[PDB]
Design a protein around this ligand. Sequence first.
Ligand SMILES: NC(=O)c1ccc[n+]([C@@H]2O[C@H](COP(=O)([O-])OP(=O)(O)OC[C@H]3O[C@@H](n4cnc5c(N)ncnc54)[C@H](O)[C@@H]3O)[C@@H](O)[C@H]2O)c1
Ligand SMILES: [K+]
Ligand SMILES: [K+]
Ligand SMILES: [K+]
Ligand SMILES: [K+]
Ligand SMILES: [K+]
Ligand SMILES: [K+]
Ligand SMILES: [K+]
Ligand SMILES: [K+]
Ligand SMILES: [K+]
Ligand SMILES: [K+]
Ligand SMILES: [Mg+2]
Ligand SMILES: [Mg+2]
Ligand SMILES: [Mg+2]
Ligand SMILES: [Mg+2]
Ligand SMILES: [Mg+2]
Ligand SMILES: [Mg+2]
Ligand SMILES: [Mg+2]
Ligand SMILES: [Mg+2]
Ligand SMILES: [Mg+2]
Ligand SMILES: [Mg+2]
Ligand SMILES: [Mg+2]
Ligand SMILES: [Mg+2]
Ligand SMILES: [Mg+2]
Ligand SMILES: [Mg+2]
Ligand SMILES: [Mg+2]
Ligand SMILES: [Mg+2]
Ligand SMILES: [Mg+2]
Ligand SMILES: [Mg+2]
Ligand SMILES: [Mg+2]
Ligand SMILES: [Mg+2]
Ligand SMILES: [Mg+2]
Ligand SMILES: [Mg+2]
Ligand SMILES: [Mg+2]
Ligand SMILES: [Mg+2]
Ligand SMILES: [Mg+2]
Lengths: 110, 215, 51, 168, 108, 43
Amino acid sequence: VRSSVHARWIVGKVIGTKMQKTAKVRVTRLVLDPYLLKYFNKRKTYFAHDALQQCTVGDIVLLRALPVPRAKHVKHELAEIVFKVGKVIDPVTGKPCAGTTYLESPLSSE
Amino acid sequence: KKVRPRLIAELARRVRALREQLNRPRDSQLYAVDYETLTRPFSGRRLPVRAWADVRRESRLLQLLGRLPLFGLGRLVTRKSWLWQHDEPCYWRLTRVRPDYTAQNLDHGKAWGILTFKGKTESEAREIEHVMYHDWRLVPKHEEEAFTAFTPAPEDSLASVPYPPLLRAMIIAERQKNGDTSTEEPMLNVQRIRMEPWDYPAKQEDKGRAKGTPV
Amino acid sequence: ELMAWNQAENRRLHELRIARLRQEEREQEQRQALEQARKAEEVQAWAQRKE
Amino acid sequence: PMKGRFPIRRTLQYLSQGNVVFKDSVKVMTVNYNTHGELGEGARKFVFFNIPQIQYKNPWVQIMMFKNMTPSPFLRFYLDSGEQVLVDVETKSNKEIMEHIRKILGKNEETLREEEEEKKQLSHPANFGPRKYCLRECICEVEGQVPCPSLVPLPKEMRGKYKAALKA
Amino acid sequence: ATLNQMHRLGPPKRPPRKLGPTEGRPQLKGVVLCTFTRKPKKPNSANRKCCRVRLSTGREAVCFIPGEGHTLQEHQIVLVEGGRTQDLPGVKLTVVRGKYDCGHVQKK
Amino acid sequence: LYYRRAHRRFVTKKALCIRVFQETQKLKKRRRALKAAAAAQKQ
RNA sequence: AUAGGUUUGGUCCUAGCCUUUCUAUUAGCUCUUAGUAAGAUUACACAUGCAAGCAUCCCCGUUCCAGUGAGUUCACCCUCUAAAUCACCACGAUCAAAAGGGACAAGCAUCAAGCACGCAGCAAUGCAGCUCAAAACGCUUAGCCUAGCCACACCCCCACGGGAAACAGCAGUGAUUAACCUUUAGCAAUAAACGAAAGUUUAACUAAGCUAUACUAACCCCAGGGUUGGUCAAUUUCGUGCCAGCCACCGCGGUCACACG
RNA sequence: CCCCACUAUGCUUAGCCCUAAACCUCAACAGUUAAAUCAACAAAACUGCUCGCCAGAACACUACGAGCCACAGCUUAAAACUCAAAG
RNA sequence: ACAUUUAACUAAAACCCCUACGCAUUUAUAUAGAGGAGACAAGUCGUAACAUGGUAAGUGUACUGGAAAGUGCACUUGGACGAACC
Ligand SMILES: NC(=O)c1ccc[n+]([C@@H]2O[C@H](COP(=O)([O-])OP(=O)(O)OC[C@H]3O[C@@H](n4cnc5c(N)ncnc54)[C@H](O)[C@@H]3O)[C@@H](O)[C@H]2O)c1
Ligand SMILES: [K+]
Ligand SMILES: [K+]
Ligand SMILES: [K+]
Ligand SMILES: [K+]
Ligand SMILES: [K+]
Ligand SMILES: [K+]
Ligand SMILES: [K+]
Ligand SMILES: [K+]
Ligand SMILES: [K+]
Ligand SMILES: [K+]
Ligand SMILES: [Mg+2]
Ligand SMILES: [Mg+2]
Ligand SMILES: [Mg+2]
Ligand SMILES: [Mg+2]
Ligand SMILES: [Mg+2]
Ligand SMILES: [Mg+2]
Ligand SMILES: [Mg+2]
Ligand SMILES: [Mg+2]
Ligand SMILES: [Mg+2]
Ligand SMILES: [Mg+2]
Ligand SMILES: [Mg+2]
Ligand SMILES: [Mg+2]
Ligand SMILES: [Mg+2]
Ligand SMILES: [Mg+2]
Ligand SMILES: [Mg+2]
Ligand SMILES: [Mg+2]
Ligand SMILES: [Mg+2]
Ligand SMILES: [Mg+2]
Ligand SMILES: [Mg+2]
Ligand SMILES: [Mg+2]
Ligand SMILES: [Mg+2]
Ligand SMILES: [Mg+2]
Ligand SMILES: [Mg+2]
Ligand SMILES: [Mg+2]
Ligand SMILES: [Mg+2]
């Protein structure tokens, strides 16, 4: 629960899987433009330890901070795959969906 | 953000630390004194005016131990300053003595003993301080028993001291504010506090040492 | 306590979804029944022309 | 004029009117909303109007938005313990969503009042110092006290130029 | 520009301010090299007395000597100031009357 | 990820930078065996 | 900005430049007193004097204060844990390094690629990756976000070692610059060092000296400087004659000049 | 400038070159005709959204750098001095 | 590169290396000489542009000429064609 890594929980998009057991994840935060007072995305890349090499490019993942950094740039681990690329399960209904259409009707299992 | 490594700052640091251990100034060099001018030649600093008389007329601890067979191991050594100040017997029971071989007369070095101050004996032996002072005296064997013969005085002392005016008023006011009604006056407990004399031997293990720069 | 209330709110909303989805299928089935009828006539009419 | 539709959203006054100050547990807020469909209108308005207010009050919370990934809009909060709070927002108005998340994950009005009182104690009326930090710079400002020599020349007897001349 | 475009460019990059003939300094010390006159541009006509000085910076520049009558010679010390002489194109320095060798104009 | 011309000066420098790396790898490994051999001799 | 002058034969539009406001240095001319504040142009070279001692010897201190702005994303937050203070083993608290994470100047993209800058494994070793137009890598500029902080302490980022012989401590001098404070006094106040202490030391500091740079208050006798075509408050008569000169902008002066003396 | 003659060239095949008043000088997409319609002229006035581009004239379709089958080339593209206008 | 201890009736002594760097590399000032741009009351030759400017103008490109410029090819209107039938 006590870790030296500043970012404890961050969600991001997996953008690279060329390193062994390391997923390169793009994390975007909304930052206020002081002059325009409009929020613009600012993106930062995080290396996440993926022991099982289950991450595919384009999937949304949840990263948990490691207690201490395991490498120079590897400070996080893959806690969860929130949305698998092209294989999303609707969290509200629990059914497989393809974009905005249900692949299996929510009424099948009542 | 990548700091450019400074490698000469670490090299010199190690070299300095080493030279301070190899070219260290020995006890003979540091604590030598010129009795004609009463100045330490190594540092070239004059001794205090109040210390001049004692330096001329007194001997160092190991100056007395230099003439003893085993450097006065297990021999009681008092100090003139203690004899003058305190009536109660104050002495170090020597346990270990490491003499300086570089000294021609073996008159410098370090000593460890058990301190008995004002008739109170410490439980454990610790390093003796001010070993280089010209203040020590050797207790003769025939006189050792009589010198150490002391009767414990009554320890009765004041345990409670009145709070200072403003503090007391605030404490009492707080009682009444919280609803406590007590006629007793708040009193500090000084029994835990023990005021040692200013000349009580301090710890020689945490004391520093003069550096190597010779004059 | 608030997490249990949130989960209860999500379950209530799920029941309303199931009701809404059931009605939409009924309407879907009807529209799909009429499209199939129209399509079948078009295919038959076109098949006759090619024959 | 100011650019964009509803330019009011880009004003510090509007950005400070958000009433949702998340508890310290909340770390990440994900907003999954659909760009079309009447059942998702509230989520679209909540993204349009309220995310700027939420982010302004919670600068260190990561807000990430995903378009047209699921048939229905929903919010998910990732708490520091690891708990995930899924809030379904379909059919709800943007005001209802804003009030729902305030109840379940927003600091109550009492907690916020207390924090503001702790800030008050940082500045002490009696402390003398520069105007940025203190009300008064010198005691000479207090009426009755000897005034500053810059404004009122001190008596000659209180000036060291003549405390020495009189003595010698 | 759009709000996205304005964010990407950022605030206007203030065009860097140009240092004039004195190099952002009120006055410069100079040594007189030669004294000549220059004909003004249209529609004016005159023989405006000027001099060429080597400034303490090392640059050599033409400086207008104001007033009626100057006694400046070569290898003399003058203090120059800014202020262009509208008549003479490219004369952007003026000799200060009353400092070092350059004396005050003699009354009438 | 990036759309930029790979002109001649870049193609040549990138080819050399890969060769220099490949050579540095080999020399770093030849300074592994020599160090191992000397350590083995002491024993 | 409450705006103003200025493009043309004239109008409207656009546009730059400039005027009017408030400061800070320097120059000219000029100046009476009092209080207070502030006070080399240059990290250029420095004569002389002083600026750290205390104390019954050991220690402690001289690693602070004071000074400078050369370099420059070490200053802030989180984690972690030294030294240090709470008389001492505690104790936790306070304070705060190293280390880990995050954040954090300006201009230039005619600086567009960097060239080893990644990951895995106990290791062996394997894999070929890593940063970058959301500005990597570079160049240039600058002390900063001022209850103050950061950095430097003659130079080689460092300082074992070399160059070499050091005022960026106070006062002072040379050179240099448009840039110009005394080679005063005292430890009485506060701060620091040391002592168990009475006390000792301190160019920190305090009280003075110098200077219209600024503020405040006076002043019986004592006022100067700039300006006077328009913008913009305010010119009489002569002299001069596109000459001599003036001008922030527009412009004036070739014999009747409110513009020059 | 007018007349006559004739060549490169206009054509074919195979590679280059990469420019134009390449301008309908009016960007793509989605709407609107009610208010203030609206400096002038031109081809009525506007809204949403996005990308590209522009900040006095001239220097300058220029210098230097970089890239390019281009080698008297094209693309990108400044500054110093000058002016109080240019338009 | 390199070095492995003495001493021990209490506990101590001993410890100390060498390689860089110059007409290398980076940026900038100076220029024999060779040219540009701007400024500049009254110089010379022609008359290219502004009117159908007396061959309408201009863009790209090519060749050509003391000099503005000329001509070929395509393109533009930021020219015109007199706006019922004669
Ligand atoms: N230059 C890149 O490699 C790159 C990488 C990621 C995204 N982009 C995208 O390019 C745009 C901004 O580019 P810029 O203005 O910095 O470039 P720019 O105009 O400075 O062009 C420099 C380089 O960028 C390339 N480039 C230009 N426009 C591009 C575009 N739309 N997409 C990709 N490459 C482009 C050019 O080919 C050239 O190599 C945005 O759409 C941005 O998301 C460009
Ligand atoms: K004139
Ligand atoms: K204007
Ligand atoms: K003055
Ligand atoms: K001491
Ligand atoms: K600096
Ligand atoms: K240094
Ligand atoms: K004092
Ligand atoms: K056209
Ligand atoms: K012509
Ligand atoms: K024409
Ligand atoms: Mg500690
Ligand atoms: Mg630190
Ligand atoms: Mg670009
Ligand atoms: Mg600097
Ligand atoms: Mg140094
Ligand atoms: Mg000095
Ligand atoms: Mg110096
Ligand atoms: Mg001054
Ligand atoms: Mg003073
Ligand atoms: Mg007259
Ligand atoms: Mg006059
Ligand atoms: Mg032919
Ligand atoms: Mg066309
Ligand atoms: Mg477009
Ligand atoms: Mg349309
Ligand atoms: Mg061209
Ligand atoms: Mg060119
Ligand atoms: Mg260039
Ligand atoms: Mg070139
Ligand atoms: Mg030449
Ligand atoms: Mg003609
Ligand atoms: Mg013609
Ligand atoms: Mg033609
Ligand atoms: Mg011809
Ligand atoms: Mg026309």
